[PDB]
Design a protein around this nucleic acid. Structure first.
Length: 121
RNA sequence: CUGCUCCUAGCAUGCUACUACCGCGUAGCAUUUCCCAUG
């Protein structure tokens, strides 16, 4: 369908055959990233799960024919990474201690996002 | 306000695996043992 619940339907190849993936408009995602209330996202170092949640809905933009949408997805990934590492520096240096296990690598590789659409859970 | 999802924490549940010692079951086993008159 051309549009349903503000989701554009795209058909791509997943696994061994083809399935439909609903992808959102890009402008809405970028606007939600840019403009917010105060402190809710005035400094993302305080709150990172926002962009994690945002990226999950931006994943089907990767399989789009035009590449700008994949660029948006990768931009979100890079920003998540930069936020996480700068948070690590801020916390480790001028405080005492942060890290014994990372467990946070997963949030910058498309393996975790793609599992969101795997027909098994 | 309804619906979906994520993360964290906690709780509780189930499951698995490990160790531990205990108890119980089982085998090998080392062991340590000597027969005699008669319807």
């Amino acid at each position: 369908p051309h549009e349903f619940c503000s989701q554009h339907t795209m058909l791509v190849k997943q696994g061994d055959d083809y399935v439909y993936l609903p992808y959102p408009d890009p402008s809405r995602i970028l606007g939600a990233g840019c403009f917010v209330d105060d402190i809710v996202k005035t400094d993302g170092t305080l709150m990172i799960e926002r962009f994690v949640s945002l990226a999950i809905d931006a994943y089907p933009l990767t399989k789009h024919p035009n590449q700008e949408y994949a660029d948006v997805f990768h931009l979100y990934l890079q920003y998540i990474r930069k936020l996480h590492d700068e948070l690590t520096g801020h916390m480790l240096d001028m405080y005492s201690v942060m890290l014994t296990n990372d467990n946070t690598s997963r949030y910058w590789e498309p393996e975790f996002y793609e599992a969101m659409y795997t027909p098994h859970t």
